[PDB]
């Protein structure tokens, strides 16, 4: 009857919806590769979708996906085995080389803009009208590493202007040079900012930004990558 | 480490007046107060709400539907506020009896107030829907929010309007009351041979369970990659970063496949939309085409 | 067998148990120690369910059903065909899920991401463990747990419900339902918002976060932002399953009467308990 026609129709609808959904989710990372970068023989039953093009907002151009995929960078890794499916060892220092938990991607070397075309993320000193409104103010606080040594001190908060939100703390090293630490990787305490991911001696190694009043999407990725990677790689120097 | 459920440090600056685009700035309000309370979790700004012509129609109708039920609850309470507060969940505005069919000629103390309140709800919802569409056209955005909302409208539309009409009676509709609309729901299942046997009801459940499953997955995933600025999803679509890669790879390594940053939101909007879509079909077929889902299930047909 | 960007991530390390013994992939799947654990518990459990299918005399999945021991057995063991198979399968299931969560933690460490996912999954595991384990033990028999079958588990839901009248009236159950409905509402909106910004009217430029913020302010007068909606989703969901577990742990244990009659505490509050008029006077 009408009911079992509906339910039968629905199951066919749902299969085509699953198909559409899965192919939609193949616009990045595909086609699949062998560990050496050549196209894998078995792609699975789903085809790559017809490409689509995003018109990016601020004269920044076009993105078409799926498109030609490449890491626009060297990968310092080597096979540990003669067959597929095993770990690939770092050939140098994985923090510096940017592999493993320390990975970054070659994102565009421009900063993210807001809807009005202005830098999304600014230092708060250069940010008109922005102040700490609640919680402990971190600015001026010393910064500790996972080895319980002081690495530096906070000299500003970089804020997301549209989201009105702290994204980085800017930290001054014994150099007098500064680095960015991501907010999501620091514990703002009563008397200090604590950083579990990194030990004091790795703060110098944090990638630096090339202008001091903006971060680029490429630089955000190299910084967040570096400091996350310390959870694994700075675990010798971690005490508590 | 820090988990990122509440912000450690709040930060305020100048009230944000929003993107202009094609919006009639004349109809926007002024930025309201900043809530420090709200800003530990989300934004602090209770800033501007756009109140156009449709917004006022919707808000007037809504309060009218809301007050129509309310005066009736007082008439039942004997105008005594102590009884009103004692029996609040027990009061009920019920539809017209089967006698009056699909007619509007019927006394107020016998379903007339029900028709009135329902008319007001009908215009409150559809105007708000048009508002959801128009609000998006002004900003030049796609109409996704308006389509997803149409799906919720569907179940609602079926329960109170479409299905009462195909049965030829307003008595088949849901009454206005906390405990009574619950009773109606239990009663409905009982009168149709146990709704657990309705194959659309069970699909609706799969999608509802799956909505909690998906958002648990997605939300937890964005929090896990927020240390690489994963929440900035829109830019991560235009220019994939390491946040989107370790998010995809977590799931590929766990269950053998993965989404994209855009793709996960198509999964999301559909999983939810199908809740009330299949649900509305399951209710519409009950009492029009299938009298008893136990019986139907024995010989599907 | 690799995503174009995947190789740089497939490094050694992060395992919780067994060093580099199980540190490898099979196709897309990470293995690890708990990968092996999950396979064991999953293989065993599936074998026992097949062996429970022969004791019943069906290879029909719509009919197959593994029942708990009857109430007579209490919190003790049972003969295989009479409830011991359920009891063992239950131990196997618990082993499969806990192993799956801990395998998610090893994947987390290798990728250097947070632990929010294994954490969220443990609420699901907790709801299961409430039904098959915690509520049974507090009540005094495995027989109160639900059976493993596609429709027979729905039977249990229905009978367990109506043991207490219309189960709508369980107040923790009311709260649980609200979060479920609210979560699906939030998932619809979040999905719709991002997609409407990424996929604008034809020919227009890809919209921005500010357009998302503006849209929601225009509409409802407030907007929660990018971090907040993902915090909201995780929380509506985790809360729904929390109150679900809660509504069942109190049922048959501290409350065993009709749930509709619980609500008499409100109506017989002495200051209005006697006044005439209304529904309850
Ligand atoms: C879905 C199929 C059935 C049905 C079955 C149920 C069941 C079963 C339950 C409800 C519940 C609710 N139903 Mg109902 N309900 C239906 C159709 C409706 C419609 C409608 C179609 O227009 C409306 C307006 C409601 C409205 C309501 C609310 C009073 C309540 C929670 C809503 C919610 O969380 O949404 C999310 C939307 C929001 C805007 C967010 C709301 C979040 C907060 C503020 C609400 C807290 C409620 C809390 C549990 C306390 C309840 C006590 C009273 C509020 C005094 N129902 C049909 C007839 N409904 C639950 C209830 O608690 O009833 C007493 C409940 O257990
Ligand atoms: C949760 C509270 C109640 C309950 C109430 C209901 C009600 C009410 C309904 C279901 C429904 C379903 N229940 Mg139940 N169910 C319970 C506990 C469980 C558990 C468990 C705790 O381990 C499992 C495995 C299931 C599984 C299932 C599915 C067969 C079905 C749809 C699930 C879904 O879409 O969720 C979302 C999850 C996903 C989309 C992820 C994919 C999950 C897949 C689909 C599960 C299939 C596994 C199944 C075939 C068993 C395989 C075991 C071995 C591997 C062979 N329920 C308890 C007793 N369940 C609906 C149904 O259609 O019944 C026939 C229905 O109407
Ligand atoms: C004794 C009860 C019966 C039963 C009878 C029913 C009935 C009857 C119905 C359901 C329905 C549903 N049931 Mg059932 N159900 C039972 C047992 C279960 C169990 C379980 C045992 O575990 C589960 C998991 C469910 C789960 C579900 C849902 C999947 C489904 C509702 C989807 C929804 O989100 O509506 C919530 C959403 C809406 C109603 C959308 C409406 C929104 C509108 C547009 C606007 C509202 C707001 C308004 C303007 C007012 C403003 C107020 C604001 C606060 C300002 N049922 C048993 C067998 N069930 C529904 C269904 O779809 O069946 C197929 C349905 O009608
Ligand atoms: C006639 C039926 C009764 C009733 C009796 C009950 C009873 C009794 C129960 C509920 C429960 C629930 N009810 Mg009720 N309920 C009724 C009507 C309703 C209505 C309605 C009428 O609209 C609604 C919306 C609900 C809604 C709900 C939810 C709050 C809750 C189920 C969610 C849950 O617990 O997830 C929790 C999720 C899980 C346990 C799943 C765990 C998954 C595990 C960890 C992993 C599975 C892996 C799998 C095996 C592997 C698959 C592998 C393959 C590769 C896929 N009920 C009426 C009044 N209700 C249940 C509850 O609250 O607690 C459980 C419950 O037991
Ligand atoms: C797929 C279906 C799911 C879903 C999705 C969904 N719902 C939606 C949408 C979507 C995608 C919208 O875009 C739309 C929305 O606007 O979201 C914010 C909406 C919406 N879903 C809502 C509710 C809702 N949806 C529900 C369910 C569901 N919606 C499912 C989970 C339910 C359930 C569970 O039953 C409810 C309760 C509304 C919040 C909103 C539509 C609002 C509306 O149309 O009403 C018009 C206005 C009134 C009735 C207001 C009067 C009544 C009030 C009680 C008075 C207070 C208002 C005000 C504060 C007065 C101020 C006056 C003066 C004092 C200033
Ligand atoms: C906060 C809880 C919410 C949620 C979240 C959630 N679930 C999760 C996760 C998260 C965060 C994951 O990381 C994990 C995942 O991997 O998702 C893809 C998962 C997961 N949630 C799942 C299911 C699931 N979640 C459910 C519910 C919920 N999960 C809530 C909505 C339900 C419901 C609503 O019923 C189901 C069916 C799986 C897809 C997955 C876990 C997969 C897994 O544990 O693998 C190990 C086990 C096996 C391969 C099979 C073992 C078989 C057993 C040994 C025998 C069978 C025993 C069983 C009792 C049979 C009963 C069947 C009958 C009842 C029909
Ligand atoms: C930042 O956005 C994010 C992503 O990406 C950028 C994502 O991808 C995802 C993930 C989400 C999706 C891909 C969307 C679709 C997902 C769903 C609808 C959820 C429901 C999922 C399922 C039904 C799939 C269930 C399958 C499972 C658990 C795996 C089945 C397993 C097998 C057949 C093999 C068994 C494996 C074992 C035992 C482990 C060890 C293995 C050995 C071989 C030994 C999310 C949440 C996300 O937020
Ligand atoms: C930029 O983008 C945006 C989106 O999308 C991308 C959005 O969708 C939205 C909007 C989203 C929505 C979901 C709005 C819909 C409407 C709502 C009302 C949602 C808000 C919900 C609630 C107020 C109720 C749910 C939450 C509560 C009550 C708080 C959490 C409570 C608990 C965890 C329970 C507390 C427990 C206790 C005390 C212990 C109890 C223990 C025992 C009894 C034992 C916005 C603003 C947005 O801007
Ligand atoms: C404190 O006192 C004051 C003054 C503030 C007032 C108090 C008010 C109170 C206490 C109000 C309480 C209201 C409640 C609790 C309402 C509860 C509703 C519930 C629980 C569920 C709602 C379900 C209703 C649905 C499914 C209605 C669907 C309606 C339609 C699909 C449209 C109906 C249309 C009709 C009959 C025809 C209209 C005419 C045409 C053709 C356009
Ligand atoms: C294979 C028979 C036809 C099945 C139809 C299923 C369609 C599912 C939706 C896919 C199209 C999606 N959409 C609407 C975004 O274009
Ligand atoms: C609810 C489950 C839906 C399942 C949809 C299909 C999942 C398998 C997709 C495999 C595509 C990927 N791969 C690994 C071949 O690249
Ligand atoms: C709808 C019933 C349950 C469906 C379960 C589907 C399991 C999907 C897992 C397939 C993963 C596949 N792959 C491509 C990695 O081999
Ligand atoms: C939590 C949701 C709250 C929604 C209501 C608050 C947002 C709108 C505030 C408008 C206040 C306007 N003003 C100052 C012109 O009166
Ligand atoms: Fe998202």
Flag if B10 and A134 touch (Cβ within 8 Å).
Answer: yes
> Is the backbone of residue C19 left (phi > 0), alpha (psi -120 to 50) or beta?
left
C34 with C95: CB under 8 angstroms? no
Burial class of residue C195, CB neighbours in 10 A (0-12, 13-18, 19+): buried
Nearest to A165 by CA among B9, B162, B202, B185: B9
Give residue for tokens 């009005």.
Answer: A116
User: Do B148 and B73 reside in the same domain of the chain?
Assistant: no
Does ligand 3 have an atom closer than 6 angstroms to the CB of B275?
yes
Whole-number Å distance between alpha carbons of B172 and C250 = 35
Flag if B19 and A116 touch (Cβ within 8 Å).
Answer: yes
User: Do C159 and C234 reside in the same domain of the chain?
Assistant: no
Of ligand 7's listed atoms, the one at least distance from the Cα of C31 is 40
Give residue for tokens 């230092």.
Answer: A123
B172 to each of A162, A215, B98, C204, how far by Cα in Å?
49, 62, 8, 47
Phi, psi of B63, deg, nearest 5: -70, -30
Whole-number Å distance between alpha carbons of C234 and C239 = 8
User: Do B105 and B197 reside in the same domain of the chain?
Assistant: no
Whole-number Å distance between alpha carbons of C88 and C80 = 9
The alpha carbon torsion through B33, B36, B38, B44 (nearest 10 deg) reads: 50
Flag if B211 and C116 touch (Cβ within 8 Å).
Answer: no
What is the sign, positive or negative, of the torsion defined by CA atoms of A48, A36, B238, B257?
Answer: positive
Q: Note the Cα B294 to chain centre separation in Å.
A: 30
Query: Which SS3 state, helix, strand or coil, does residue B74 take?
Result: helix
C166 with C260: CB under 8 angstroms? yes
> Is the backbone of residue C218 left (phi > 0), alpha (psi -120 to 50) or beta?
alpha
Flag if A100 and C112 touch (Cβ within 8 Å).
Answer: yes
Cβ-Cβ contacts under 8 Å for B242 (sequence gap 6 or more): A103, A104, A105, A221, A224, A225, B228
Q: Note the Cα B173 to chain centre separation in Å.
A: 19
Flag if B48 and C221 touch (Cβ within 8 Å).
Answer: yes
Best mutation site among A134, A137, A228 for testing chain B: the one with the most B CBs within 10 Å? A134
Domain count, chain B: 2
Q: Which of C97, C173, C175 to mutate to test the pocket of ligand 4 (most atoms within 8 A of CB)?
A: C173
User: Do B291 and B184 reside in the same domain of the chain?
Assistant: yes
Neighbours, chain C (3 or more CB pairs < 8 A): A, B
Give residue for tokens 């359920």.
Answer: C86
A58 with A119: CB under 8 angstroms? no
Whether a cis peptide bond, with omega within 30° of 0, leads into A66 is yes
Buried b vs exposed e over C65-81: b needs ≥16 C-beta within 10 Å? bbbbbeeebeeeebeee
DSSP state of B104: S
The helix (run of H) or strand (run of E) holding residue B12 is: strand B10-12
Give resolution, Å, one decimal. Answer: 2.6
Query: Measured in angstroms, how far is the CA atom of residue B147 from the centroid of ligand 11?
Result: 26
Whole-number Å distance between alpha carbons of C30 and C39 = 12
Last residue of a domain, one of B109, B142, B175: B142
User: Do C130 and C66 reside in the same domain of the chain?
Assistant: yes
C275 with C281: CB under 8 angstroms? yes
Whole-number Å distance between alpha carbons of A167 and A113 = 15
| Within a domain: C271 | no
Last residue of a domain, one of B122, B142, B162: B142
Cβ of A196: how many Cβ atoms within 10 Å? 18
> Is the backbone of residue B33 left (phi > 0), alpha (psi -120 to 50) or beta?
beta
Number of residues written out for chain C: 281
Whole-number Å distance between alpha carbons of C11 and C32 = 13
Contacts of C208 in chain A (CB under 8 A): 57, 113-115
**Domain span holding position C204:** 164-263
Phi, psi of A165, deg, nearest 5: -160, 135
Contacts of A228 in chain C (CB under 8 A): 112-113
Query: Measured in angstroms, how far is the CA atom of residue B45 from the centroid of ligand 13?
Result: 9
Nearest to C82 by CA among C67, C63, C65: C67
Give residue for tokens 């009978």.
Answer: C159
**Domain span holding position B194:** 143-301
User: Do B55 and B124 reside in the same domain of the chain?
Assistant: yes
User: Do C152 and C57 reside in the same domain of the chain?
Assistant: yes
H, E, C per residue of chain A = CHHHHHHHHHHHHHHHHHHHHHHHCCCCCCCCECCCCCECCCCCCCCCCCCEEEECCCCCCEEEECCCCCCCCCCCEEECCCCCCCCEEECCCHHHHCCHHHCCCCCCCCCCECCCCCECEEECCCCCCCEEEECCCCCCCEEECCCCCEEEEEEEEEEECCCCEEEEEEEEECCCCEEEEEHHHCEECCCCEECCCCCHHHCCCCCCCCCCCCCCHHHHHHHHHHHHCHHHHCCCCCCC
User: Do B33 and B137 reside in the same domain of the chain?
Assistant: yes
Alpha helices in chain B (DSSP H): 53-77, 81-86, 112-139, 144-157, 163-167, 178-191, 199-224, 233-238, 242-255, 263-284, 293-298
Flag if C11 and A77 touch (Cβ within 8 Å).
Answer: yes
Nearest to A160 by CA among B31, B10, B24, B167: B10
User: Do C203 and C86 reside in the same domain of the chain?
Assistant: no
- The tokens describing B205, both together, are 């459940």
Cβ-Cβ contacts under 8 Å for B2 (sequence gap 6 or more): A184, A185, A186, A187, B8
User: Do C22 and C3 reside in the same domain of the chain?
Assistant: yes
A100 with A94: CB under 8 angstroms? yes
Cβ-Cβ contacts under 8 Å for C69 (sequence gap 6 or more): C77, C78, C82, C83, C84, C86, C87, C141, C142, C143
- Count of alpha carbons within 13 angstroms of residue C18, beta-carbon side: 13
User: Pocket around ligand 5: residues whose beta carbon is below 6 Å from it?
Assistant: B 58-59, 62-63, 66, 124-125, 128, 132, 145, 148-149, 151-152, 272-273, 275-276; C 181, 184-185, 188-189, 192, 220
Give residue for tokens 């069970």.
Answer: B202
Adjacent-strand bridge partners of C273: none
A112 with A121: CB under 8 angstroms? yes
Judge whether A197 is closer than 8 Å to chain B, CB to CB: yes
Cβ of A175: how many Cβ atoms within 10 Å? 10
Whole-number Å distance between alpha carbons of A138 and A188 = 7
Whole-number Å distance between alpha carbons of C98 and C178 = 28
C210 with B18: CB under 8 angstroms? yes
- Please spell the DSSP secondary structure of chain C, one letter per residue: -B-TT-GGG--S---SSSTTSS--EETTEE--HHHHHHHHHHHHHHHHHHHHHHTTT---TTT--BPPPPGGGTTS---GGGTHHHHHHHHHHHHHHHHHHHHHHHHHHHHT--SHHHHHHHHHHHHHHIIIIIHHHHHT-GGGSPPBSTTHHHHHHHHHHHBTBSGGG-HHHHHHHHHHHHHHHHHHHHHHHHHHHHS-STTSPP--HHHHHHHHHHHHS----HHHHHHHHHHHHHHHHHHHHHHHHTBTTTB-S-GGGGGHHHHT-TTTSS--SSS--
- The tokens describing C118, both together, are 């294994």
Whole-number Å distance between alpha carbons of A37 and C7 = 9
C117 to each of A107, A227, B42, B149, how far by Cα in Å?
26, 21, 21, 29
CA max distance for chain A = 80
Cα-based angle A33, A38, A39 (whole degrees, multiple of 5):
55
Of ligand 10's listed atoms, the one at least distance from the Cα of B266 is 15
Flag if A164 and B44 touch (Cβ within 8 Å).
Answer: yes
Number of residues written out for chain B: 301
Give residue for tokens 């129509």.
Answer: B68
Q: Are strands A187-188 and A193-194 parallel, antiparallel or unpaired?
A: antiparallel
Nearest CA to ligand 7 atom 31: B255
What is the sign, positive or negative, of the torsion defined by CA atoms of C240, C242, C247, C251?
Answer: positive
Whole-number Å distance between alpha carbons of C210 and C198 = 12
Domain count, chain C: 2
C135 with C122: CB under 8 angstroms? no
Whole-number Å distance between alpha carbons of A66 and A43 = 15
Cβ-Cβ contacts under 8 Å for B203 (sequence gap 6 or more): A10, B274, B278, B282
- The tokens describing B128, both together, are 């708000």
Adjacent-strand bridge partners of A180: A170
Whole-number Å distance between alpha carbons of C81 and C51 = 10
Whether a cis peptide bond, with omega within 30° of 0, leads into A31 is yes
Nearest CB to A108; choose among B200, B239, B243: B239
Q: Note the Cα B9 to chain centre separation in Å.
A: 33
Nearest CB to A77; choose among C7, C23, C113: C7
C186 with C281: CB under 8 angstroms? no
Cβ-Cβ contacts under 8 Å for C264 (sequence gap 6 or more): none
Q: Identify the nearest ligand to the CA of B162 by its number.
A: 9
Flag if C4 and A103 touch (Cβ within 8 Å).
Answer: no
Whole-number Å distance between alpha carbons of C116 and B225 = 10
Give the residue from chain A lying closest to C109, CA to CA. Answer: A232
| Within a domain: C8 | yes
Whole-number Å distance between alpha carbons of C49 and C42 = 11
Nearest CB to B212; choose among C169, C180, C218: C180
Cα-based angle C155, C158, C164 (whole degrees, multiple of 5):
140
Whole-number Å distance between alpha carbons of B217 and B225 = 12
Cβ of C271: how many Cβ atoms within 10 Å? 9
Whole-number Å distance between alpha carbons of B33 and B12 = 12
Give the residue from chain A lying closest to C25, CA to CA. Answer: A85
Q: Note the Cα C192 to chain centre separation in Å.
A: 25
User: Do B155 and B296 reside in the same domain of the chain?
Assistant: yes
Whole-number Å distance between alpha carbons of B211 and B215 = 6
Flag if C209 and B225 touch (Cβ within 8 Å).
Answer: no
Cβ-Cβ contacts under 8 Å for B119 (sequence gap 6 or more): none
Q: Note the Cα C191 to chain centre separation in Å.
A: 22
User: Pocket around ligand 8: residues whose beta carbon is below 6 Å from it?
Assistant: C 182, 185-186, 189-190, 193, 212-213, 216, 222-225, 229, 232, 239
- Please spell the DSSP secondary structure of B172-190, one letter per residue: GSPPB-HHHHHHHHHHHHH
Query: Measured in angstroms, how far is the CA atom of residue B264 from the centroid of ligand 11?
Result: 13
Please tell me the distance in Å from C219's CA to the nearest CA on chain B: 6
Break positions in chain A: residue before each gap, C to N over 2.5 angstroms: none
User: Do C75 and C51 reside in the same domain of the chain?
Assistant: yes
Of ligand 13's listed atoms, the one at least distance from the Cα of C220 is 4
Phi, psi of A138, deg, nearest 5: -75, -20
Whole-number Å distance between alpha carbons of B87 and C82 = 49
Query: Measured in angstroms, how far is the CA atom of residue C188 from the centroid of ligand 8?
Result: 14
A139 with A152: CB under 8 angstroms? no
The helix (run of H) or strand (run of E) holding residue B11 is: strand B10-12
Interface of A with B in 85-124 (CB under 8 A): 103-105, 107-108, 112, 115-116, 124
Q: Are strands C29-30 and C25-26 parallel, antiparallel or unpaired?
A: antiparallel
User: Do B131 and B268 reside in the same domain of the chain?
Assistant: no
Query: Measured in angstroms, how far is the CA atom of residue B125 from the centroid of ligand 5?
Result: 8
Nearest CB to C2; choose among A35, A99, A113: A35
The helix (run of H) or strand (run of E) holding residue B10 is: strand B10-12
Nearest to C193 by CA among C213, C212, C219, C220: C212
- The tokens describing B239, both together, are 């220019």
Cβ-Cβ contacts under 8 Å for B99 (sequence gap 6 or more): none
Of ligand 6's listed atoms, the one at least distance from the Cα of C41 is 54
| CATH number of the domain within which B188 lies | 1.20.85.10
Burial class of residue A8, CB neighbours in 10 A (0-12, 13-18, 19+): exposed
Nearest to A101 by CA among C30, C111, C15, C11: C111
User: Do B122 and B244 reside in the same domain of the chain?
Assistant: no
Contacts of A87 in chain C (CB under 8 A): 10-13, 20, 23-24
Q: What domains, with CATH codes, occur in chain A?
A: 2-106 (4.10.540.10), 107-239 (3.90.50.10)
| Within a domain: C270 | no
- The tokens describing A31, both together, are 């086609």
Last residue of a domain, one of C163, C180, C200: C163
A211 with A123: CB under 8 angstroms? no
Burial class of residue C2, CB neighbours in 10 A (0-12, 13-18, 19+): buried
Best mutation site among B1, B3, B32, B136 for testing chain C: the one with the most C CBs within 10 Å? B136
Judge whether A70 is closer than 8 Å to chain C, CB to CB: yes
What is the sign, positive or negative, of the torsion defined by CA atoms of A239, A240, B4, B7?
Answer: negative
Cα-based angle A230, A232, A234 (whole degrees, multiple of 5):
50
| Within a domain: C268 | no
A155 with A170: CB under 8 angstroms? yes
What is the sign, positive or negative, of the torsion defined by CA atoms of B46, B51, B54, B59?
Answer: positive
Flag if C166 and B269 touch (Cβ within 8 Å).
Answer: no
Best mutation site among A28, A68, A194, A223 for testing chain B: the one with the most B CBs within 10 Å? A28
- The tokens describing B231, both together, are 């929440």
Flag if B266 and C210 touch (Cβ within 8 Å).
Answer: no
C190 is in an annotated binding site: yes
Whole-number Å distance between alpha carbons of A152 and A150 = 6
Q: Can you say which residues of B are annotated as belonging to the binding site for Fe cation?
A: 218, 233, 265
Burial class of residue C154, CB neighbours in 10 A (0-12, 13-18, 19+): middle
Buried b vs exposed e over B207-236: b needs ≥16 C-beta within 10 Å? bbbbbbbbbbbbbbbbbbbbbbbbbbbbbb
- The tokens describing B237, both together, are 């679509």
> Is the backbone of residue B263 left (phi > 0), alpha (psi -120 to 50) or beta?
alpha
User: Do C199 and C159 reside in the same domain of the chain?
Assistant: no
The alpha carbon torsion through B182, B186, B192, B196 (nearest 10 deg) reads: 110
Last residue of a domain, one of B116, B142, B168: B142
> Is the backbone of residue A116 left (phi > 0), alpha (psi -120 to 50) or beta?
alpha
| Within a domain: C280 | no
Whole-number Å distance between alpha carbons of A108 and C69 = 63
Whole-number Å distance between alpha carbons of B285 and B288 = 6
Whole-number Å distance between alpha carbons of C281 and B83 = 9
| CATH number of the domain within which C70 lies | 1.20.85.10
Give residue for tokens 């007001």.
Answer: B120
Cβ of A192: how many Cβ atoms within 10 Å? 16
Cβ-Cβ contacts under 8 Å for A102 (sequence gap 6 or more): A94, A95, A225, A226, A228, A229, A230, A232, A233, C112
B254 with C104: CB under 8 angstroms? yes
Of ligand 5's listed atoms, the one at least distance from the Cα of B211 is 31
In this structure, which long-range contacts are made by residues B94-97, counting pairs with CB atoms below 8 Å and at least 24 apart in sequence?
Answer: B94/B175, B94/B180, B95/B170, B95/B171, B95/B172, B95/B173, B95/B175, B96/B170, B96/B171, B97/B171
User: Do B287 and B168 reside in the same domain of the chain?
Assistant: yes
User: Do B206 and B128 reside in the same domain of the chain?
Assistant: no
| Within a domain: C153 | yes
- Please spell the DSSP secondary structure of B136-153, one letter per residue: HHHHT--SHHHHHHHHHH
């Amino acid at each position: 009857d009408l009911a079992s026609l509906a339910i039968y129709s629905f199951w066919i609808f749902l299969a085509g919806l699953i198909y559409y959904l899965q192919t939609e989710n193949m616009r990045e990372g595909y086609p699949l590769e062998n560990e050496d970068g050549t196209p894998a023989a078995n792609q699975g039953p789903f085809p790559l979708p017809k490409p689509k093009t995003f018109i990016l907002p601020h004269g920044r151009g076009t993105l078409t996906v799926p498109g030609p995929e490449s890491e626009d960078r060297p990968i310092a890794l080597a096979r540990t085995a003669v067959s597929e499916g095993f770990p690939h060892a770092p050939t140098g220092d994985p923090m510096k080389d940017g592999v493993g938990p320390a990975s970054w991607v070659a994102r565009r070397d421009l900063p993210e803009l807001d809807g009005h075309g202005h830098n999304k993320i600014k230092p708060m000193k250069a940010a008109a009208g922005f102040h700490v409104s609640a919680g402990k103010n971190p600015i001026g606080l010393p910064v500790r590493g996972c080895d319980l040594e002081i690495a530096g001190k906070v000299v500003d908060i970089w804020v997301d202007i549209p989201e009105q939100m702290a994204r980085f703390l800017e930290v001054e090293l014994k150099d007098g040079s500064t680095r960015l630490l991501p907010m999501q990787m620091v514990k703002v305490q009563s008397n200090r900012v604590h950083v579990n991911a990194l030990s004091s001696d790795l703060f110098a190694g944090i990638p630096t930004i090339k202008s001091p009043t903006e971060v680029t999407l490429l630089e955000e990725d190299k910084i967040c990558g570096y400091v996350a990677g310390g959870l694994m790689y700075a675990a010798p120097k971690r005490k508590s | 480490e820090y988990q990122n459920i509440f912000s450690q440090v709040q930060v305020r600056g100048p009230a944000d007046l929003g993107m202009t685009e094609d919006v009639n700035l004349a109809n926007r309000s002024g930025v309201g107060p900043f809530s420090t309370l709200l800003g530990w979790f989300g934004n602090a700004q209770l800033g501007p709400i756009y109140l156009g012509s449709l917004g006022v129609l919707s808000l007037f109708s809504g309060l009218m539907w809301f007050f129509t039920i309310g005066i009736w609850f007082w008439y039942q309470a004997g105008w005594n506020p102590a009884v009103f507060l004692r029996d609040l969940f027990f009061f009920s505005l019920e539809p017209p009896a089967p006698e009056y069919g699909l007619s509007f000629a019927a006394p107020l103390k016998e379903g007339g107030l029900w028709l009135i309140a329902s008319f007001f709800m009908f215009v409150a919802v559809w105007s708000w829907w048009g508002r959801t569409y128009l609000r998006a056209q002004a900003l030049g955005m796609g109409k996704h929010t308006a389509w997803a909302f149409l799906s919720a409208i569907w179940l609602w539309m079926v329960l109170g309007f479409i299905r009462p009409i195909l049965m030829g009676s307003w008595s088949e509709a849901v009454p206005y009351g906390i405990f009574s609309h619950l009773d109606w729901t239990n009663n409905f299942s009982l009168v149709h041979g146990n709704l657990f046997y309705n194959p659309f009801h069970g699909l609706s459940i799969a999608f509802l369970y799956g909505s909690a499953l998906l958002f648990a997955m997605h939300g937890a995933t964005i929090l896990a990659v927020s240390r690489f600025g994963g929440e900035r999803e829109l830019e991560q679509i235009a220019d994939r970063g390491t946040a989107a890669e370790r998010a995809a790879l977590f799931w590929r390594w766990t269950m053998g496949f993965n989404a994209t940053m855009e793709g996960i939101h198509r999964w999301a909007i559909w999983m939810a939309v199908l809740v009330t879509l299949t649900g509305g079909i399951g209710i519409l077929l009950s009492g029009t085409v299938v009298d008893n889902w136990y019986v139907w299930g024995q010989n599907h047909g | 067998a690799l995503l174009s960007f995947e190789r740089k991530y497939r490094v050694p390390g992060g395992t919780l148990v067994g060093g580099n013994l199980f540190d490898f992939w099979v196709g897309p799947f990470y293995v690890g120690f708990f990968g092996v654990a999950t396979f064991f518990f999953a293989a065993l459990g599936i074998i026992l369910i097949a062996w429970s299918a022969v004791l019943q005399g069906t290879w029909n999945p719509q009919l197959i059903s593994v029942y708990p021991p009857a109430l007579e057995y209490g919190l003790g063991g049972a003969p295989l065909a009479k409830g011991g198979l359920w009891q063992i399968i239950t131990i196997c299931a618990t082993g499969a899920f806990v192993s799956w969560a801990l395998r998610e933690v090893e994947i987390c460490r290798k990728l250097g991401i947070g632990y929010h996912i294994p954490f969220a999954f443990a609420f699901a595991i907790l709801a299961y463990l409430t039904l098959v384990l915690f509520r049974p033990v507090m009540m005094g028999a495995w027989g109160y747990a639900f059976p493993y079958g596609i429709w027979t588990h729905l039977d249990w839901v229905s009978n367990t419900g109506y043991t207490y009248g219309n189960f709508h009236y369980n107040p923790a159950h009311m709260i649980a339902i609200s979060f479920f409905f609210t979560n699906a509402l939030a998932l619809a909106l979040h999905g719709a918002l991002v997609l409407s910004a990424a996929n604008p009217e034809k020919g227009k430029e890809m919209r921005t976060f500010d357009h998302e913020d503006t849209f929601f302010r225009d509409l409802v007068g407030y907007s929660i932002g990018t971090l907040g909606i993902h915090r909201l989703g995780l929380l509506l969901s985790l809360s729904a399953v929390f109150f679900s577990a809660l509504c069942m742990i109190i049922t048959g244990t501290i409350w065993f009467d009709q749930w509709v009659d619980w609500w008499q505490w409100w109506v017989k509050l002495p200051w209005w308990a006697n006044i005439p008029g209304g529904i309850n006077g």
